[PDB]
Amino acid sequence: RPVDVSVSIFINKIYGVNTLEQTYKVDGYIVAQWTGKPRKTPGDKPLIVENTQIERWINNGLWVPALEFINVVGSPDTGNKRLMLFPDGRVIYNARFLGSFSNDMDFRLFPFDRQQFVLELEPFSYNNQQLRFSDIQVYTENIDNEEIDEWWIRGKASTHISDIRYDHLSSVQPNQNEFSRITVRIDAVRKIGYFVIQTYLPCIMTVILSQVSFWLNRESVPARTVFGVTTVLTMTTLSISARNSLPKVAYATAMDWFIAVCYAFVFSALIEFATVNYFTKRGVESVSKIDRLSRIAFPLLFGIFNLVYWATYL
Amino acid sequence: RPVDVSVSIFINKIYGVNTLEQTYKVDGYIVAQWTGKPRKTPGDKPLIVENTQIERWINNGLWVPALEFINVVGSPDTGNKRLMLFPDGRVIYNARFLGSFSNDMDFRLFPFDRQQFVLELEPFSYNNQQLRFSDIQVYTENIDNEEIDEWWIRGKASTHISDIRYDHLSSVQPNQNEFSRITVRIDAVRKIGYFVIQTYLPCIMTVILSQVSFWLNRESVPARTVFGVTTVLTMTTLSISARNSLPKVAYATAMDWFIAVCYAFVFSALIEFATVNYFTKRGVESVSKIDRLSRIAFPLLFGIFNLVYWATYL
Amino acid sequence: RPVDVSVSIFINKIYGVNTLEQTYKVDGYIVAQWTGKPRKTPGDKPLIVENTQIERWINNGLWVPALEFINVVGSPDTGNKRLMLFPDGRVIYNARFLGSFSNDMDFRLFPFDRQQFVLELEPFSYNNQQLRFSDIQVYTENIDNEEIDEWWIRGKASTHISDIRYDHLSSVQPNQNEFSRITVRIDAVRKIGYFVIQTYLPCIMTVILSQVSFWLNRESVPARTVFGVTTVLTMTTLSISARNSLPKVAYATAMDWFIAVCYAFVFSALIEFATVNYFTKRGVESVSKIDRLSRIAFPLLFGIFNLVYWATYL
Amino acid sequence: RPVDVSVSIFINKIYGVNTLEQTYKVDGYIVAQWTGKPRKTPGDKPLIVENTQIERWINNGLWVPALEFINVVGSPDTGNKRLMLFPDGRVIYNARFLGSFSNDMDFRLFPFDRQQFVLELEPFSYNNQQLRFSDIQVYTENIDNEEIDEWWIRGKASTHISDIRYDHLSSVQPNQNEFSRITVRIDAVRKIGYFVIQTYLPCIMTVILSQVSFWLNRESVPARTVFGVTTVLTMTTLSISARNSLPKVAYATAMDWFIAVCYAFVFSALIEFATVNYFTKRGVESVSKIDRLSRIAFPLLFGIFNLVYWATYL
Amino acid sequence: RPVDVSVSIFINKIYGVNTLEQTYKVDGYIVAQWTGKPRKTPGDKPLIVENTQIERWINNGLWVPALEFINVVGSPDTGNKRLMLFPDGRVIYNARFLGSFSNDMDFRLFPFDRQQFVLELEPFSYNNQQLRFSDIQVYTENIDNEEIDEWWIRGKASTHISDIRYDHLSSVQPNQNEFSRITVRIDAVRKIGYFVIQTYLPCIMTVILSQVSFWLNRESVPARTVFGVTTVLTMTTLSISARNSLPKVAYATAMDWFIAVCYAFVFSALIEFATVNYFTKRGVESVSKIDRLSRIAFPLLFGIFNLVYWATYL
């Protein structure tokens, strides 16, 4: 019996990539072709039915199986549908879809993470013994040209047909609760320019500003105090505002570690100033070797750490 | 008489956990099976009906009872439906649902709180004398593996069949106003890493920054003035911003008490500086035993308080 | 003639209290019972019709009057409906509703205000000469426990049946433009803990910090300058963020008067410091009775004002 | 031939005034009465049809013209409808509507601007040669007695019936493309209390704080430096946050000019301090006539500017 | 064969231009006229059908093709529809639409960028061999006068009728997979007043404030320290808040480069002050030629940079 269904999915665009809710909107077309009883259309050309007569056609016994996306969040926005009825028997169901899909994303390497936009299509009411997906072909011609998003599409699409077992139908369908599933995966990487400008360069210049304190002698303590407190508060607000752009994930990201290292450098600069002020105890000059060596240690350590960082993750 | 209805609920995913509105979105499938009068299916195969033919079947007298979720917020997003009609009489209703459900949450131990995601399913128009839930089986196979939400699910779901009394039917149905109710409960705990990084570490480093003032002698008043005002304003902004992620609840949370203790420490450090400034009335220094002992009292008290706090709530 | 209709409203929950839009969401059930012409049910048992046959039944001449909420914002989300048809003629319409209702709210005593949640139900197309509300019974069993979500429910519900005249039907229906209206009112008060923690305690501690300036002599001008400018800016931002939680109503609230008094206290402290700095020369030396008396006048005045304030409104 | 249609519009409430999108939500009732061919009602009483039978009535040839709001944003929320059918032929269509309407607003005098809430009703598919609006009666009894939510209603509503030509139907119907249009206009003014408290009083007190620097001698420069930089930064953030509540327009508002003048005053105070500090070089405590005359020039100039401003626009 | 379809698009308004999501809402009317088989209308006058009979007419064999927008995001909000049926055979489909359309936008020249609002209309189910677009006419009479809502319309609308090939229909339609497409493009430029007031004037005045430091001698290190740190932090927050109004695009905009140059100037001023402080040796006046030349170089370089900048991009 099992009806062989050939599926072709045209992807018009991907957008609305919300990393907080871990959703992304997909606009495209879906074509589902199977082979039924032969028919006689007016002329050799096949007959075309637009959405509403479709009801009547399935009310008079025409078999049109309902397909459903698993990753969708809420009923996907279904546009116009159409039925092409061929004289040689093949029936084709074509519909436009606008859907908010979901997929598990891992942000450990954020903002250098690699993710996948996934479509999991699956028939309803019909198991693999009744309906089986023969082939799948994805035509991603629109987005593959330029990868227009805050993301970058890396490579062609991947297709896979699998069989998924549901235990909640075993109470009904005995030993017949396996459904055929089409899986479409699109690999993508994150472009870091926005994140550079918004968090990395601010942290770098904040560390530089903190280091500027070293090139003052055991001078007006308020000046270096202003440096220290200003820089530590700036780094705190930067860490908060940077992690506000991610979901509340127990694990730490690469941006988290970078911010932590910059925070440690700024706090170490402040503690160094406090230390060298604790050792002044005198109305003499005696410029301190501590600051003279810090003026080199801090920038050189920051530079080699940045080299290690950016050599990693890239 | 009472029609025994067997229910199986497959939960595809839980997401959209909004602690402000105390809602959470649940996507899954629902199966409701009962045994009616025998019928004649076409062929030996049981009959399958997809949503629209369903109308015709309920127009020709087929009895399909309406079930409803109590925790839902608005009409739940209903996907595709299906009826499996068996020759031996049993009818089976299978449908996908995506709903925003509600449940009373208690935030006294926030962010260490433990909550439960609840589904309250119940028939409409039919009491326990007409329709009764025989058994319930929940299949939470997808999410129980790794908990990739902002929460952590601990264990399988709990099922409960109960009888609920309604006073708004007591005005008509005397002593016959009891409805069968299925309740599915999923226990969850909150991951605190986001809250750690966003409020606790900032508060801790702000307390450290406030304590740094002790390591300046009593002469430069402005430096320690900047320290005190900077730290108290930072702690105020942190107190404000921390409760921004919670509903407006009259009661206090654990994070509230932690912030209050940190604020007390910062303000007490500032008042200590003001006190040692009150003894400046001289042209002498006499480095103050107050600061010399504070450099130990403040950090040690903060450390033992952190020990007590983090030993509690965990 | 006038058909007597008995109405019972079961309130499942009240939530979504948006003080900005002056709206609130109510989820519950509505029951409307009247006595019509007798009918012949299959068997002695009364007949039950679930939503869809309902259409068919009114297509065969069944008279089902349309009821409407006046306070509602948009078409309320109606869940499942049901008709209980008795052989003796009485009809019962039971349906679940979830609606966003509106009511004029007065925020003069904010955040100590007391408000009312109102439901104004009224028939459509039928006047008091055709349809009359006989009795009303509200069954608020779920929420009566002094529920959560920023408010406190004080007492049971109040019911009132009235007659409202419409001038826009006078152009057609002469002397027949009076409609019967059911009004359900639920008194509620606001929990102030959130508002305390978010604005009052910050303002109080800001005033305390501003007063701390007095315990510095008139010598270090910058320290007290930092105190004054920091505190006045803090109070300005606090006033802004405090009125950010209210609609643009133009009248003054209790929070407005409290913030204004705290602002006056902070600015008066700054002005006192500026005056004594203009008097650091021209007639004083190193100690001033002005500060010695301010250290008592400012805290005592603030305390007695706080006593008067908090004794009021409570 | 042309069907004379009598229209009566009851306005229940106006709310949701979003100045950013220049929209406003209007809830009310609409009545449209015309005189058609006589019919046979059951009994002498006229017939009443509630929405759903309405379909059947328009399915058997009853002529019900479609009306449309032009200013509406999206399909307006249509509640319950009703048809009153008289035996002498006259038909009456009554329906509740809730719509988000739009109207061109000019914000040059903001926040002292005067705007108009407009309803543009117009038939669809039928020109003035087939359907003509005879008269209009607006019954704004509910809301006109009081304020709205943030605005003030000045006077009753104004009505106008006009004829509008559409060029996109000129391609088909030659010289018969004129449509009758009903226009309802309600004048409104903006309440300024919120804007006063949120921007005007903050700017005024910021100018006062900036002027406080003058009452410090050419003493420790950091204090007056703190004054200047604090005040200029405060005025910058205030200007930004003030224009954040308006759409991104090209012209300047009254609030813009007020903030600009305050900014000029603050920056001039800072520049004055910088100038007198370039002349502070001396070893005497000589107080400068520049500051002594500024202590009068700046407050008096600000006061006369405030007088001119508030005398204008009011 | 190919049915020539004439299309006319009336644009009522364009609004809701969200640059973050790169969407814009378009409300208007659409008219599609073709020539079918002659019919007999009641009288010689054409027949008019209002939405609901439309169903019936397509149920009795009337051919009404479904058209679809490609740039739309989700199912467009369709208002009222209408069919004008002429006796000479021509059919006209007229409907009001309100849709959120999308178009690829390039923000490299932001905020001086030039963009285009695009509508791509295209038939469904019918290729160029079955349905062909004969002509297209856009009537943008209402909105073309104002150029309102943060943009400026430059010129009338442009049309392009093309044939687009779909490779995902080659599996079904061999050599018959070309669809006729109407493309309407409206060129527009961005109004910069809002962006001027919100970022440019703040950055310019911040550069001025930073330069003010030169007019203080090298005596009070803290005053110029406050100047430097305040100005660099202000520029950092301004850059962040400025890019907060844009999508996360890997490339840099003109506003980005302006902010970068202002940041470089401010940081260079601070570094210059630190250098001149490193020359504090020679405890006699020794005022430094560095400041004497900076007081001219910094303002003159900033002025010539502003001249080059604003002469470009304009």
Secondary structure of chain E in HEC code, one letter for each residue: CCEEEEEEEEEEEEEEEECCCCEEEEEEEEEEEEECCCCCCCCCCCEEECCHHHHHHHHCCCCCCCEEECCECCCCEEEEEEEEECCCCEEEEEEEEEEEEECCCCCCCCCCCEEEEEEEEEECCCCCCCEEEEEEEEECCCCCCCCCCCEEECCCCEEEEEEEECHHHCCCCCCCCEEEEEEEEEEEEECCHHHHHHHHHHHHHHHHHHHHHHHCCCCCHHHHHHHHHHHHHHHHHHHHHHHCCCCCCCCCCHHHHHHHHHHHHHHHHHHHHHHHHHCCCCCCCCCCHHHHHHHHHHHHHHHHHHHHHHHCCC
Residues of E in contact with A137 (CB under 8 A): 168, 171
Tokens of A16: 């609305």
Note the helical H segments in chain B: 52-59, 193-195, 201-212, 221-242, 254-278, 289-311
Query: Contact, B193 vs A251, CB < 8 A?
Result: yes
Tokens of A265: 């450098």
Amino acid identity, position C222 = P
Residues of B in contact with A263 (CB under 8 A): 205
| B221 at interface of C, judged by CB pairs closer than 8 A | yes
User: CB-hemisphere CA count at 13 Å for C87?
Assistant: 7
Of C75, C125, C250, the CB nearest to D82: C125
Q: Which of B20, B56, B77, B172 to mutate to test the interface with C (most CBs of C within 10 A)?
A: B172
| D75 at interface of C, judged by CB pairs closer than 8 A | no
H or E segment to which residue D240 belongs? helix D221-243
Measured CA to CA, the distance from residue B181 to residue B69 in angstroms comes to 10
From the list B244, B247, B5, the residue with the least C-alpha distance to B102 is: B247
Measured CA to CA, the distance from residue A33 to residue A93 in angstroms comes to 7
Please report the residues numbered 137 through 156 in chain A whose beta carbons come closer than 8 angstroms to any beta carbon of chain E.
Answer: 137, 139, 141, 148, 150
Residues of E in contact with D252 (CB under 8 A): 193
Q: Which long-range contacts (CB under 8 A, 24 or more apart) does E279-282 make?
A: E279/E218, E280/A217, E280/E218
Does the beta-carbon distance from B21 to C8 stay under 8 Å?
no
Q: Which residue is it, tokens 């654990």? A: B254
Residues of B in contact with C197 (CB under 8 A): 239, 243, 256
Query: Contact, C71 vs C121, CB < 8 A?
Result: no
Tokens of C287: 């100690």
Span between the terminal Cα atoms of chain E, in Å: 52
Phi first, then psi, for residue A167 (nearest 5°) are -80, -20
Query: Contact, C178 vs C128, CB < 8 A?
Result: yes
- B138 forms beta bridges with B9
| E59 at interface of A, judged by CB pairs closer than 8 A | yes
DSSP state of A72: B
By CB atoms closer than 10 A (0-12, 13-18, 19+), residue A92 is: buried
| E166 at interface of D, judged by CB pairs closer than 8 A | no
Measured CA to CA, the distance from residue C154 to residue C188 in angstroms comes to 6
User: CB-hemisphere CA count at 13 Å for A85?
Assistant: 18
DSSP state of C251: S
Query: Contact, D29 vs D97, CB < 8 A?
Result: yes
Phi first, then psi, for residue A259 (nearest 5°) are -65, -40
Q: What does B37-73 look like in DSSP terms, one character per residue? A: S----SSSSPEEE-THHHHHHHHTT-----EEESSBS
The reply, when asked if residue E34 is annotated as ligand binding, is no
Of A150, A192, A226, the CB nearest to E229: A226
Amino acid identity, position A203 = C
| C216 at interface of B, judged by CB pairs closer than 8 A | yes
Query: Contact, A170 vs A129, CB < 8 A?
Result: no
Span between the terminal Cα atoms of chain B, in Å: 52
Amino acid identity, position D305 = F
Chain C: closest CA distance from residue B145 (Å)? 33
Residues of D in contact with E42 (CB under 8 A): none
Cα E235 versus chain centre, distance: 27
Query: Contact, C161 vs C179, CB < 8 A?
Result: no
Q: Which residue is it, tokens 């709310």? A: D15
Residue C36 backbone zone (phi > 0: left; psi -120 to 50: alpha; other: beta): beta
Measured CA to CA, the distance from residue A123 to residue A32 in angstroms comes to 11
Measured CA to CA, the distance from residue B148 to residue B153 in angstroms comes to 9
Measured CA to CA, the distance from residue C13 to residue C26 in angstroms comes to 6
Query: Contact, C97 vs C28, CB < 8 A?
Result: yes
| DSSP 3-state of D40 | coil
- C93 forms beta bridges with C32, C83
H or E segment to which residue C203 belongs? helix C201-212
Tokens of E126: 């019918």
Does the beta-carbon distance from D172 to E92 stay under 8 Å?
yes
Query: Contact, B9 vs B29, CB < 8 A?
Result: yes
Of E9, E12, E226, the CB nearest to D222: E226
From the list A6, A49, A157, the residue with the least C-alpha distance to E171 is: A6
Give Cα separations from D87 to B41, D49, D53, D54, D65 (angstroms): 52, 14, 18, 17, 19
Give the CATH fold of the C1-191 domain: Acetylcholine Binding Protein; Chain: A, (2.70.170)
Query: Contact, E96 vs E25, CB < 8 A?
Result: no
Q: How many residues does chain D have?
A: 314
Give Cα separations from A31 to A62, E164, E169 (angstroms): 17, 18, 8
Does the beta-carbon distance from D84 to C171 stay under 8 Å?
no
Residues of D in contact with E197 (CB under 8 A): 239-240, 243, 256
Rg value, chain D, Cα: 31
Give Cα separations from B267 to A101, B239, D108 (angstroms): 49, 14, 47
From the list A267, A261, A256, A266, the residue with the least C-alpha distance to B198 is: A256
Please report the residues numbered 258 through 287 in chain A whose beta carbons come closer than 8 angstroms to any beta carbon of chain B.
Answer: 263, 267, 270-271, 274, 277-278
Query: Contact, E10 vs E139, CB < 8 A?
Result: yes
Chain E: closest CA distance from residue A202 (Å)? 7
- Measured at the alpha carbon of residue C88, what is the angle toward residues C84 and C90, in degrees to the nearest 5? 45
Query: Contact, A6 vs A135, CB < 8 A?
Result: yes
| B226 at interface of C, judged by CB pairs closer than 8 A | yes
A303 Cβ contact list (under 8 Å, min separation 6): none
| D288 at interface of C, judged by CB pairs closer than 8 A | no
Tokens of E309: 């900048």
Measured CA to CA, the distance from residue A43 to residue A22 in angstroms comes to 50
Of A31, A217, A230, the CB nearest to E168: A31
The residue of chain A with its CA nearest to that of B83 is A125
| B240 at interface of C, judged by CB pairs closer than 8 A | yes
Helix E254-278, helix A201-212: angle, nearest 10: 10
Tell me the resolution in Å.
Answer: 3.2
Query: Contact, D155 vs D187, CB < 8 A?
Result: yes
Measured CA to CA, the distance from residue E154 to residue C201 in angstroms comes to 55
Residues of D in contact with C164 (CB under 8 A): none
Residues of A in contact with E263 (CB under 8 A): 205
Measured CA to CA, the distance from residue E254 to residue B310 in angstroms comes to 50
- Measured at the alpha carbon of residue C78, what is the angle toward residues B91 and C125, in degrees to the nearest 5? 125
Q: How many residues does chain A have?
A: 314
Does the beta-carbon distance from A166 to B10 stay under 8 Å?
yes
The residue of chain E with its CA nearest to that of A94 is E125
Tokens of C29: 């059930």
Tokens of E258: 């302006």
- Measured at the alpha carbon of residue E23, what is the angle toward residues E22 and E25, in degrees to the nearest 5? 155
Helix C254-278, helix D201-212: angle, nearest 10: 10
Return the partners of chain E (3 or more C-beta pairs < 8 Å). A, D
Peptide bond into B111 cis (omega under 30): yes
Does the beta-carbon distance from C191 to B278 stay under 8 Å?
no
Query: Contact, A84 vs A34, CB < 8 A?
Result: no
Other beta carbons within 10 Å of D278: 11
| C115 at interface of B, judged by CB pairs closer than 8 A | no
Phi first, then psi, for residue D12 (nearest 5°) are -75, -50
From the list C36, C29, C6, C32, the residue with the least C-alpha distance to C135 is: C6
Tokens of E243: 């890019």
Count of D–E CB contacts within 8 Å?
125
Other beta carbons within 10 Å of E220: 17
Residues of D in contact with C65 (CB under 8 A): 50
| C60 at interface of D, judged by CB pairs closer than 8 A | no
User: CB-hemisphere CA count at 13 Å for C32?
Assistant: 22
Phi first, then psi, for residue A117 (nearest 5°) are -90, 120
| B249 at interface of C, judged by CB pairs closer than 8 A | yes
Does the beta-carbon distance from D270 to E137 stay under 8 Å?
no
Measured CA to CA, the distance from residue E229 to residue B230 in angstroms comes to 15
Measured CA to CA, the distance from residue C101 to residue C117 in angstroms comes to 8
* Backbone gaps in chain E, preceding residues (C–N over 2.5 A): none
Residue burial B225-247, b: 16+ Cβ < 10 Å; e: rest: bbbbbbbbbbbbbbbbebbebbb
- Measured at the alpha carbon of residue E245, what is the angle toward residues E241 and E249, in degrees to the nearest 5? 105
Range(s) within chain A of domains with CATH label 2.70.170.10: 1-191
Query: Contact, C123 vs C178, CB < 8 A?
Result: no
Residues of C in contact with B252 (CB under 8 A): 193
From the list E308, A246, C237, D216, the residue with the least C-alpha distance to B240 is: C237
Other beta carbons within 10 Å of E5: 23
- Measured at the alpha carbon of residue D184, what is the angle toward residues D178 and D190, in degrees to the nearest 5? 140
- Measured at the alpha carbon of residue E299, what is the angle toward residues E297 and E303, in degrees to the nearest 5? 110
Rg value, chain C, Cα: 30
Residues of B in contact with A233 (CB under 8 A): 230, 234
